[PDB]
Amino acid sequence: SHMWIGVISLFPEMFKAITEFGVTGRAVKHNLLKVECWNPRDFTFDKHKTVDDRPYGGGPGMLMMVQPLRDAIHTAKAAAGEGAKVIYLSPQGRKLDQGGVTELAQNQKLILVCGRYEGIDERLIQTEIDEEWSIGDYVLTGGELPAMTLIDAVARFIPGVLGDGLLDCPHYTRPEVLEGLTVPPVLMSGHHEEIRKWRLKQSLQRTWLRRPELLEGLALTDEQRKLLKEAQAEHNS
Amino acid sequence: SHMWIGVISLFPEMFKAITEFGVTGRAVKHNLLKVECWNPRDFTFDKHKTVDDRPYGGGPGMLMMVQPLRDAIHTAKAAAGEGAKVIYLSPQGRKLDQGGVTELAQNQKLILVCGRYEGIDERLIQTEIDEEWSIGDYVLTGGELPAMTLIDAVARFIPGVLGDGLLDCPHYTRPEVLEGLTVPPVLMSGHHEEIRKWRLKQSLQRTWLRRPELLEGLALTDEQRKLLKEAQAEHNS
Ligand SMILES: CC(C)(C)CNc1ncc(C(N)=O)c(N)n1
């Protein structure tokens, strides 16, 4: 099953970062992921191709001009056909987490609207946007990096693109000793079950130490409860 | 005051997305922000320029090979001189928010290590990395988009790049009526103080409705307490 993502952006060439490189680049080349861009600048009619406009009420910044942006959105919606969810990315949106990625990955078509300047007219959010999403509680110069982050995250769910609430365990590769630090012997034991339990215990320990609030949201298995208790006992010596 | 950011990445051309476009592109052209990239592939010695390696303990994925990555990091550190903080980006790191952006923006030099595959050897985190940071609780195919997100966020603090804990207020531009929706008359009143209070009240209302936990962390001013009370009264009709 493939995924189609329409993007509205003043800087469509930024999207080469995901369409030309790495796992996502392969997904695009293999037609597993399609990314199509529309630029509001192409929908302007004045000589200077104006894409910003002044905010009612004054203020230091500018907003995206409504007409070119609205026309670009409508063109993207026509290209998508029916069933495409239109998303605006901003810090005022629902904060993205891996559960939200999983939800968004259920869509076969998405349209991502990338804001620049101080943002977009509130009435376009009311009339054109289905959902507002944020990649995190911080402020950027534009919505393109958030859009690409979202695309990369959801692309991992497309069948063929790739070859539990806890933080990842530590990983080791060659050499066996690096600046005096050795690989945990269990990882060289060849005992698959002991290795699985070590990695799970490490993930539980790391989540407890670094992000204890994430543990509150989990219903730990019996095995996970035991390994977490073991890790906490070792921490308390 | 300018900022220098060294980047370690297998896909340095992805960084054109921030260095060639928009506000960050201007910052680079004007020498306010410098982004310098080193690619571990350039530090390999085998015929096929191998940059991945197998994890001790088995598993489905690969890790970044230690030697090319270590050598790239050391070269970046030599180029940076003293005082450069080395950051690894992963979901196991401290979660980025605007307060964390402000902290990171105090550095004149940063080195950002971008992981690919299943990540990097834990001992390199111990021996080479000063701080681990996450852009959010979700999983991506590589650390490049997180690195670019971080760069964009901190670049906004560099003097000359640009022309309070609450969500932003709604913004409006032309036309006065859009699909039957009118601009709030206060924004056309020309009354600067009434406009300021309306925007602040809207920010308080939106934060309360969408992200009430963010309000708990704020020490509201008298004015903010009053406007929030007004907005909550209007919500309860
Ligand atoms: C100002 C404008 C909203 C137009 C773009 N800046 C921006 N900053 C942050 C995010 C985010 N955290 O998701 C985003 N989507 N966009």
Ligand SMILES: CC(C)(C)CNc1ncc(C(N)=O)c(N)n1
């Ligand atoms: C797997 C590997 C860690 C190498 C890169 N994937 C990744 N996914 C997410 C983030 C983040 N949330 O910050 C990140 N920095 N990197």
